[PDB]
Amino acid sequence: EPPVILSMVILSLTFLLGLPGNGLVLWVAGLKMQRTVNTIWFLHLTLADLLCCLSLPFSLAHLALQWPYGRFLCKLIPSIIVLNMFASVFLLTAISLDRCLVVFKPIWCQNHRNVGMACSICGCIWVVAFVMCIPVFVYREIFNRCGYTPLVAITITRLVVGFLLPSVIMIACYSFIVFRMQRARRQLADLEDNWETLNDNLKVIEKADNAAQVKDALTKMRAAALDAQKATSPEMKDFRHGFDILVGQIDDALKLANEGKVKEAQAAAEQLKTTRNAYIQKYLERARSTLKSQSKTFRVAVVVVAVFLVCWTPYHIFGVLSLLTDPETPLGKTLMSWDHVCIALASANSCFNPFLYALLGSIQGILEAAFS
Ligand SMILES: Cc1cc(C(c2ccc(Cl)cc2)c2ccc(Cl)cc2)sc1C(=O)N[C@@H](CCCN=C(N)N)C(=O)O
């Protein structure tokens, strides 16, 4: 019975902390940035969460007075929460799919990457959510007990569609993304190692006397340069041409040192710095910058997805347990009591969502950086 008071305080806290931040995010993202295929999805998700939190007061009013005013509210208010759940799940799986498909072939990257396509797909998402929602409105009546055979079927259908299939799709997509991301790292690591050995060999060769250490350092440099050139477009051709020039200069230095000349070998070795800086530095800088960008986004998506699933799982666990377990048992007496807190958490998810955007990213300077 105290759990009922826990439910009402949870609902009240969500209502008080959900309207301001969500409306703030909606306004900031709506009237500051410029329409792109990426931020429209987060705008739709925030709008759905705001619509969910806008119908909270009535649930609290019902829960405070055990509704002696109209049958319409008992049939409408439970529908909005389910519509919120369906729209949020579908938008999250669309976001995941798009993020995993960006790194695919350019066929889908250049095909129809336009804002109109995003608007149309969001329209289809909302339509499907509404069609899936209508059953809940239809199968609900006042006996003032507000509850529901079709019960055994509706719960299974909802569990299958809104929680099982999209979960598998997102898990597979993010597993593929992380497996592909862990691969690029090794290649960058190897290229950095080759650059490092080239660098310190070129450093030692300057201070090295006699023609034997010069040949040894040049041999190590040549091996490193060949290995780096093997690692892998106009920039690609440019990269390979730069390494070909570098290997040519290394050969010139080696042939000069073979004939027992030191100072000329030193000058030939010093000559490689200009070509190195003019050719490979820009590619190295791009390869560093062309990495963090992805992380600042993959983590932002993964945290949102995981938090959503964690907040919504008790709802379906308790739904299944109420479906299988028979009533008229002392278990049901507390099962009904705990159903309220489960639903309260499932509805409270909307307060958790808008804080992660600020935590993981001026109001604009943070929100716009998060929505990238
Ligand atoms: C979201 C929601 C909210 C509901 C309650 C309610 C709100 C706040 C709190 Cl703290 C406690 C109760 C409510 C009361 C009066 C009014 Cl006017 C509106 C809502 S019922 C309900 C819901 O969707 N039920 C599902 C399946 C039910 C069984 N599922 C289990 N067991 N997991 C459905 O009907 O299809």
Author numbering: 20 to 85, 88 to 164, 170 to 174, 331 to 365, 1001 to 1049, 1060 to 1118, 370 to 439, 449 to 459
Give the text the authors published on this PDB structure.
In contrast, JR14a-bound C3aR-BRIL shows high structural similarity to apo C3aR-BRIL, with an RMSD of 0.5 Å for 224 Cα atoms, adopting an inactive conformation, characterized by a closed intracellular side where TM6 remains close to TM3. This inactive state was further supported by the conformation of conserved microswitches, such as the DRY, PIF, and NPxxY motifs, as well as the toggle switch, all of which exhibited an inactive-like configuration in both the JR14a-bound C3aR-BRIL and apo C3aR-BRIL structures. Although the overall architecture of JR14a-C3aR-BRIL represents an inactive conformation, JR14a binding induces conformational changes in the extracellular segments of C3aR compared to the inactive apo structure of C3aR. Specifically, while a significant portion of ECL1 and ECL2 was unresolved in the apo structure, likely due to the high flexibility of these extracellular regions in the absence of a ligand, a specific region of ECL2 was well-resolved in the JR14a-C3aR-BRIL structure, by participating in the interaction with JR14a. However, these conformational changes did not propagate into the TMD, including the conserved microswitch region, resulting in an overall inactive conformation. Thus, our structural analysis suggests that JR14a-bound C3aR-BRIL represents an early intermediate state of C3aR, an agonist-bound C3aR that has not yet undergone full activation by G protein coupling. The cryo-EM map showed clear JR14a density in the ligand-binding pocket of both the intermediate and active structures of C3aR (EV3 and EV4). Notably, although the binding mode of JR14a remains largely conserved between the two states, JR14a is positioned ~1.5 Å deeper in the fully active structure than in the intermediate state. In contrast, in the BRIL-fused intermediate structure, M1063.36 has a “side” configuration, oriented toward TM5 and TM6, where it interacts with W3906.48 and H3946.52 instead of JR14a. Our results indicate that the JR14a-bound intermediate state has a larger ligand-binding pocket (647 Å3) than the G protein-bound active structure (575 Å3).
